[PDB]
Amino acid sequence: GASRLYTLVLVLQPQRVLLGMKKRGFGAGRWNGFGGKVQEGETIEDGARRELQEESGLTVDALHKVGQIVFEFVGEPELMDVHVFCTDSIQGTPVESDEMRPCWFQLDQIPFKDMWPDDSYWFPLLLQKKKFHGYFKFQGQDTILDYTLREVDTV
Ligand SMILES: CCOCc1nc2c(N)nc3ccccc3c2n1CC(C)(C)O
Under DSSP, the state recorded for 153 is: S
Look up the domain containing 74 and give its range.
Answer: 1-155
Give the atom of ligand 1 at the shortest distance from the alpha carbon of 33: 4
Structure resolution, Å: 1.6
- 116 annotated among ligand-binding-site residues: yes
For residues 46 and 28, give the distance between their C-alpha atoms in angstroms, rounded to a whole number: 26
* Separation of CA 106 from chain center: 17
Q: Determine contact, residues 60/52, Cβ cutoff 8 Å.
A: yes
Kindly report the CATH number assigned to the domain that includes residue 88: 3.90.79.10
User: Which residue has its alpha carbon closest to ligand 1 atom 11?
Assistant: 116
Question: Measuring CA to CA, which residue among 45, 46, 116 is closest to residue 84?
Answer: 45
Judge if the beta carbon of residue 22 lies within 6 A of ligand 1.
yes
Judge if the beta carbon of residue 82 lies within 6 A of ligand 1.
yes
Question: Measuring CA to CA, which residue among 147, 95, 145, 98 is closest to residue 125?
Answer: 147
Looking at the chain, which runs of residues are DSSP E strands? 3-12, 16-22, 31-32, 64-73, 79-87, 100-106, 131-139, 143-152
Ligand 1 centroid distance, CA of 42 (Å): 19
Under DSSP, the state recorded for 112 is: G
The total domain count for the chain is: 1
Contacts within 8 Å (CB) and 24+ apart, 125-128: 125/67, 125/149, 125/151, 126/10, 126/12, 126/66, 126/67, 126/84, 126/86, 127/12
- 122 annotated among ligand-binding-site residues: no
Asked how this structure was determined, the answer is X-ray
Ligand 1 centroid distance, CA of 34 (Å): 8
For residues 155 and 153, give the distance between their C-alpha atoms in angstroms, rounded to a whole number: 7
